[PDB]
Design a binder for this molecule. Structure first.
Ligand SMILES: [C]C1=C([C])[C]=C2C(=[C]1)N([C][C]([O])[C]([O])[C]([O])[C]OP([O])(=O)OP([O])(=O)O[C][C]1O[C](N3[C]=NC4=C3N=[C]N=C4[N])[C]([O])[C]1[O])C1=NC(=O)[N]C(=O)C1=N2[S](=O)([O-])[O-]
Ligand SMILES: [C]C1=C([C])[C]=C2C(=[C]1)N([C][C]([O])[C]([O])[C]([O])[C]OP([O])(=O)OP([O])(=O)O[C][C]1O[C](N3[C]=NC4=C3N=[C]N=C4[N])[C]([O])[C]1[O])C1=NC(=O)[N]C(=O)C1=N2[S](=O)([O-])[O-]
Ligand code: SF4
Ligand code: SF4
Ligand code: SF4
Ligand code: SF4
Lengths: 149, 642, 642, 149
């Protein structure tokens, strides 16, 4: 499960939103208004998806493997950029691995959903064709499938 | 177990209601949901229709793809953009055989002829697809392609936000029940929910509703019950919400007995697809035997299924189960021998495949990489243990459980259109109510690309439905208020009975969400073919399950909640319990064992193509509290041969 | 899971030490302990010896008899005070056959020739024994008698208190380790512990130490993991403390592979003894089949064990296992048919036995009666499900795991005297250290009466040892100070690393007690023939368990505790881990399956009377951190024939 | 597990010691010094032995069956006396059973541990006889057991 490092956490300074609390798919991250520091409210419901870890601008969140099967000492630390993401995997025995993978080939927020698509029409609404088809499929026509004789 | 730091209680009458009127309402902003939002925004312009997307968390990372994915499991490739081209006929054949003969081929062939386009768009939007020096999509197996998918959801999420507009996306709003047309008992009119960030009750009025809540997990007790209870292979975020509200609305379910048992790396449940298909890894028992070899003969009884290529996934699982029962564990994924073989002495080549190996985990299930790190397991030196997890219920992966939905007019045979009042692609038996992704049953193997695709298909159909039928659903305000009271009843019950005990979680007049869940899981695990009985069950076990579920269902009326988070947890439980009952009733109804490896009816141990080569469809009547079952014979829609 | 309301932290250096000097130290105030205190108090007068009893809880209700018991399982009856008289030879035979041919007959006959006297005293002290109109003790089966035993422990507690004196009884003090003689590496010198009510470190200096801590429970994952993780058939209070400190001291263990799997009422784990022996209740599978009969053929291979009467307990379990493996559950205890048949139409007779039925649960395992009430189960109308629970490690019941102990001079053969430096009854291989009840291995079926009796035996032997050998060990202050530091280390570790995380129970530098226990339970359940694999295991699984236990043992050095309660939980965990390691190494050493029904080694499925009809004795050398094993051939000591 | 009724618990503040805290075999019952009321500190470690329930002079403790398998509504209530104990078993469906069993045939605190026993002697210390033997066993002579030839 995830956990917040008090020394690095700043309850998300003056930003408009609390990154960890905003991103968690299971509503686990929340703010302790008293300490002004975040924490996982229900760790046994953590999927260890690392979403919070990646979105914490202070890098104040890490993941400690579930106690049921995880010996202490292991860690996976991500450093997500815009076109790639870096990972450092540290083994219980001190072994340290470093990787870097691409995550996007285009600028963030640059998607034009129907770029080049023709306008929809009432006639087309009645066909089997979806937006951009059959062009986006890459075929010379709408894919045909042989019906059982 | 949940221990809230402080209370956050509200009585129903103190909670403000927010009414949202729209034409198309999409419940669930995951992959199928975003697919629906994207496509719907396109055709909606024809009628100036309003499209709304409601999500309980944040779309940017919500659902099964929160960590990303290492591959796109469904890409036919009809032109040759990848290392391997396929035909649609071979795909349909593949899926039906994998289902041991039962799949709605009209539905499968339909998403299959649309899926590639979706994949091409994903790449247009920024998804990095592994490519060969020649520029081809790198194949994993025959139907999948590798991807650098860490940001797979954020990217698809952006497409949906750009398409429908952020003002039409409601996040942190949990939908717990559908609303039906006051004017028509078999038509949808919207849905109700509440915010998990503030005291606010939502009433969504809509002409068309699309269920995209994902499947259901945590119905069964996992192999880890402590913190790791949260380490379910499938999305722990999906709790069968769609199944619950749709079935409560009267929409018929299909193949709900068809659960999926995933064989994955032990405990962390990392993926095995790439290891098996891409790295050519072998799985051997504790004595070094490659059981797919030693157990091949046992598949001879499942002709022609057992003689199909690839071998049906359930039959692969069956081979594993035989090893487990003979006590030949641990079962190992010999990654060390795979890497050496593949590298062939070339150290630089080894480094390259070694990075690819870890990316396969770091791009979709980090826990597995963390598990190796914590246990000092170096994939190039030692093998890893693999094992089948507890059952999960969904319709987009290898499981085909979900609502019985209508197919395209140009593919759906007369035999399959009978239960639909209106014939609109992906519409349920309930008018105006559509089901996609995990929610749509009888057409599995959609995965990421296929789920998004099905969402597109339903969205266009919803627009067509609206413009052609011109519905004008009226919600029943009397029912809405009843639902509002029910929505926060758990909080009011807590306040009313907490004084009976000095401990908040040990009370005789109520159970907390985590307490009801543990009970649900124990019941399903011990009676509905869970890990406890090595996925075995029988009429008696199942009947006892219904008895225990009935007790639990009654106690749901005594659920309590100490804050908004737990209130969501309460309803997530309610959703799971009904999904559980449906699954049990379906398993009890089908008298055969068609998918050994997923579950066994020891009282009906054989596969029966004489009497059960049919889809089992059911409907729940809330007014009468009665379940009615029906058998729809399977008919081959597409041309193909074993 | 544990969430302390508030902290209660102390550093070793700030905790005051209380030194207690005594001659005889009894660790554990349960049934065997109270028996040892009682008897010791009698003989101690010969030398004005001091006797000290230390209990972690409160003797009034501590241990396995906290709820009371519905019967006394061991009463020979040599004169005819019960409905059935028996002979000692018949009893020794009975026990050896039940243990599948392995039992220290010198120890078994020894307690059996003394037990009746203990029972008679129990009645003299106020224990209400069921009696017939003629005044005879009502028999349950052949060796047990029915008792109204709700206050069974409080009564035995009063006797022990009157005998030893309250000022010699230390309650709420947890003993976590033994102290050895500074000048003799194989002699005990005392023990160390701490209060769980205040900050106080105890140092007991003694000439003789008697291990009476009961067995070990919770090593394996139970059939219920939520709140019901607390519902173990055997005493959840016993966590193998004696096993740990004794083995750490170098005292040899025996038959530690011989666990005990009890067949009980499902979930509540109520007793089945009275139902089988007194009410003539039948157990049947889901299809009304009486498996003790339908599975009779499967026992024929065991000779002569399979033909013994009654059928050995493990083989009785084996028959149910076969039913479970075939998936013929639920298994039912047909109480309804048992009561009807016993009453014979007489309604007044029915009411009488109906009350007796409920007393059987309300007198020793209320949870079962509560389960019946919550599930609306009326024993006269419907049957109850039964199932085998998870493994437990103890030597007083049907299992014989414990320390290798010396027997009486007149019965112990030279073959069994070899490993003892001093031949005192019940003394371990470590001079001055005795073991009783669950702590003494190779002599089972003691139960309540037998354990108290074995305590009396060791107590007298202990006084004789002191007066004859005039022991005078000296503790090592350097070690004591190291142990004191270790004692509170968890609390100090918590304070030192808690600031690494905003959450107390999610820290990268330590594990809390409940966290380590969940892990231990998962390891044992999945690799040490737990419920997860239907009590099956093999060399590979066992070797992997040792590797995982090694990881866990290392992490014990990183345990954290937030209060005294959790500090005790911390050491209870430590105690379980080592106990579990011994169990695993013992099962790995024995290459046969002598107790199918308790566990199966799939790689050595047969019983081997040619090379394994021996006691497996091991020793752990702390200084070398090495385990050594040896086989002590069984020899029949008492005259009897099959 | 056990749970305390606030309305009935007076924290034993009119007694020399806290009954529940004193009796619990697993050290679960403790006092919340704030409320001056008892509570089970670790319910999932409760064996449901009913010791606390039986010893609470205010009858403030009861047991709510483990949630894992217990439907709401059931209860077993004891009323422990000096010579007997009364039980009321209440079913979820409303059925109520009542029972009464003996628990002791002698007055509490009346045990004379070695009544009638002769004094121990050095000679007796070397035999196999325990206190009161061989007569407490019911035989005039110490029981013999045939050793195998
Ligand atoms: C989990 C997982 C893993 C681990 C792996 C994998 C997978 C998974 N795959 C598959 C995919 O992902 C699928 O198919 C998809 O995603 C499906 O979709 P859907 O159906 O749509 O679902 P999701 O996404 O999950 O979503 C849902 C949503 O909804 C929501 N909700 C719920 N409930 C509710 C809501 N909202 C409001 N209200 C309510 N009540 C959630 O939250 C979300 O967001 C795959 N695939 C591909 O392609 N590839 C790969 O790789 C994969 N993987 S494997 O192969 O390995 O197996
Ligand atoms: C549990 C149970 C039930 C439920 C039932 C029954 C039984 C049980 N049984 C049996 C008896 O009980 C036995 O055997 C006896 O008890 C044993 O003894 P011992 O070993 O001694 O013991 P216990 O008691 O448990 O005790 C112990 C003690 O110790 C302590 N500790 C621990 N740890 C520690 C301590 N202290 C200090 N430190 C440390 N560390 C505890 O706390 C206690 O006190 C039986 N029997 C008869 O007889 N009868 C009947 O009925 C019975 N039951 S059955 O039948 O079923 O079987
Ligand atoms: S996102 Fe990071 S800095 Fe902001 S509240 Fe969460 S953990 Fe603290
Ligand atoms: S790792 Fe994922 S599931 Fe866990 S708290 Fe963070 S974001 Fe939520
Ligand atoms: S014994 Fe009863 S009155 Fe006394 S503290 Fe405990 S619960 Fe409260
Ligand atoms: S029921 Fe027994 S174990 Fe539970 S708290 Fe009360 S005394 Fe303690």
């Amino acid at each position: 499960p995830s956990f917040v490092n008090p020394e690095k956490c700043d309850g998300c300074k003056a930003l408009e939103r609390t990154a960890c609390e905003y991103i968690c798919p299971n509503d686990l991250m929340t703010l302790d208004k008293e300490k002004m520091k975040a924490y996982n409210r229900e760790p046994d419901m953590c999927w260890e998806c690392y979403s919070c870890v990646k979105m914490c601008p202070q890098g104040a969140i890490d993941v400690r493997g579930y106690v049921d099967y995880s010996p202490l000492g292991g860690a996976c630390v991500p450093m997500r950029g815009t076109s790639d993401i870096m990972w450092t995997v540290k083994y219980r025995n001190g072994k340290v691995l470093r990787f870097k993978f691409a995550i996007r080939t285009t600028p963030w927020g640059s998607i034009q959903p129907f770029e080049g698509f023709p306008e929809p029409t009432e006639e087309a609404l009645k066909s089997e064709l979806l937006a951009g088809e059959p062009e986006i499929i890459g075929t010379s026509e709408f894919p045909q499938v042989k019906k059982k004789a | 177990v949940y221990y809230p730091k402080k209370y956050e209680l509200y009585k129903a009458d103190e909670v403000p209601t927010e009414v949202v009127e729209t034409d198309i309402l999409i419940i669930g902003g995951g992959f199928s949901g975003c697919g629906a939002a994207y496509e719907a925004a396109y055709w909606a312009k024809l009628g100036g229709l309003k499209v709304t997307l409601v999500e309980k968390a944040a779309v940017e990372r919500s659902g099964a793809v929160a960590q990303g994915l290492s591959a796109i499991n469904t890409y036919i490739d009809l032109t040759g953009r990848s290392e391997r081209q396929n035909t649609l006929e071979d795909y349909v054949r593949y899926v039906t055989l994998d289902m041991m003969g039962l799949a709605r081929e009209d539905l499968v062939a339909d998403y299959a002829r649309h899926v590639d386009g979706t994949v091409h768009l994903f790449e247009k939007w920024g998804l990095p697809i592994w490519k060969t020096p020649d520029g081809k999509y790198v194949r994993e197996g025959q139907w999948q392609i590798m991807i650098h998918g860490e940001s797979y959801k954020p990217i698809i999420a952006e497409a949906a936000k750009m398409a429908v507009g952020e003002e039409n996306i409601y996040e942190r709003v949990f939908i717990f029940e559908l609303l039906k047309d006051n004017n028509d008992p078999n038509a949808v009119a919207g849905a109700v929910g509440f915010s998990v960030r503030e005291p606010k009750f939502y009433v969504f009025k809509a002409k068309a509703v699309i269920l995209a809540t994902g499947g259901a997990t945590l119905l069964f007790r996992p192999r880890s019950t402590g913190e790791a209870a949260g380490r379910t292979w499938y999305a722990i975020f999906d709790t069968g919400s769609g199944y619950y509200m749709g079935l409560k609305a009267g929409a018929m379910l299909t193949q709900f007995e068809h659960r999926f048992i995933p064989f994955r790396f032990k405990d962390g449940y990392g993926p095995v697809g790439a290891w098996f298909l891409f790295f050519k890894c072998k799985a051997k028992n504790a004595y070094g035997e490659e059981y797919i070899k030693t157990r091949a003969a046992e598949l001879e009884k499942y002709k022609p299924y057992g003689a199909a290529q690839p071998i049906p996934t359930p039959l692969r699982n069956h081979q594993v189960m035989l090893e487990i029962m003979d006590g030949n564990q641990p079962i190992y994924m010999h990654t060390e021998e795979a890497l050496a073989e593949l590298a062939g002495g070339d150290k630089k080549k080894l480094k390259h495949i070694y990075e690819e190996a870890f990316e396969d985990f770091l791009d979709m299930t980090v826990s597995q990489a963390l598990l190796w790190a914590c246990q000092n397991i170096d994939p190039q030196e030692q093998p890893s243990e693999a094992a089948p997890a507890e059952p999960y219920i969904m319709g987009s992966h290898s499981g085909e459980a979900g609502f019985w939905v209508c197919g395209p007019e140009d593919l759906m045979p007369e035999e399959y259109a009978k239960l639909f009042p209106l014939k609109y692609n992906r519409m349920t038996t309930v008018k105006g109510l559509f089901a996609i992704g995990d929610c749509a049953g009888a057409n599995p193997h959609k995965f990421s690309s296929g789920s998004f695709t099905e969402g597109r298909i339903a969205a266009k159909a919803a627009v067509r439905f609206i413009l052609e039928q011109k519905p004008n659903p009226e919600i029943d305000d009397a029912v809405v208020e009843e639902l509002k009271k029910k929505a926060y009843a758990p909080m009011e019950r807590f306040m009313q009975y907490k004084d009976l005990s000095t401990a908040d979680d040990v009370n005789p007049e109520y159970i907390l969400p985590w307490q009801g869940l543990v009970r649900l899981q124990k019941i399903m695990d011990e009676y509905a073919a869970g890990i406890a009985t090595i996925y075995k069950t029988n009429e008696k076990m199942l009947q006892r399950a219904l008895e225990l579920l009935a007790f639990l269902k009654e106690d749901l009326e005594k659920l309590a909640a100490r804050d908004l988070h737990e209130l969501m947890r309460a309803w997530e439980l309610v959703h799971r319990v009904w999904t559980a009952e449906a699954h049990v009733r379906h398993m009890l109804f089908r008298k055969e064992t068609r998918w050994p490896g997923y579950y066994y009816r020891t009282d009906y141990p054989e596969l029966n193509d004489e009497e059960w080569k049919c889809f089992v469809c059911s409907k729940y009547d809330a007014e009468k509290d009665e379940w009615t079952f029906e058998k729809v014979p399977y008919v081959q829609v597409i041309e193909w041969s074993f």
